UniProtKB/Swiss-Prot annotation:
Residues reported in the UniProt entry to bind octadecanoate: 127-129
Residue(s) carrying Phosphotyrosine: 20
InterPro entries membership: Calycin, Fatty_acid-bd, ILBP, Lipocln_cytosolic_FA-bd_dom
Protein's UniProt name: Fatty acid-binding protein, heart
Amino acid sequence: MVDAFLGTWKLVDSKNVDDYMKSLGVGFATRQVASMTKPTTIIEKNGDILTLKTHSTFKNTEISFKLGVEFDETTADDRKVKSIVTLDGGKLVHLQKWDGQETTLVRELIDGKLILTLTHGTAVCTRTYEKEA
Ligand SMILES: CCCCCCCCCCCCCCCC(=O)O
């Protein structure tokens, strides 16, 4: 059941994004611009295929996937990773693997807001998105 995640979402709060990017080895200039960027995330479904767009003034990404089926992904910071997205406890869990490393991108709905928690190493970033009508 993925349906409550679907729609267009705008960033309205961010904690520790610099820590997370730094852990991934993102350079200072990219971190600088990213810390000021407020992306729009669009999640749409067509049958079993989900498409997740992230749009901003800095970088844009798009992925399509089926839940529970691995896919190749090239992230906004240019990592080539092996990914899988699944539902766990009602949360949308996106796991990326590369070079023996892992990061998780966990999305949960709390009071109608979409909370994205990104973990790599010890770094934990929490970003809050609100739904656009
Ligand atoms: C597509 C906009 C990405 C802006 C950040 C660019 C540099 C760091 C990328 C780290 C991995 C992706 C982070 C996604 C954060 C989010 O969706 O709010």
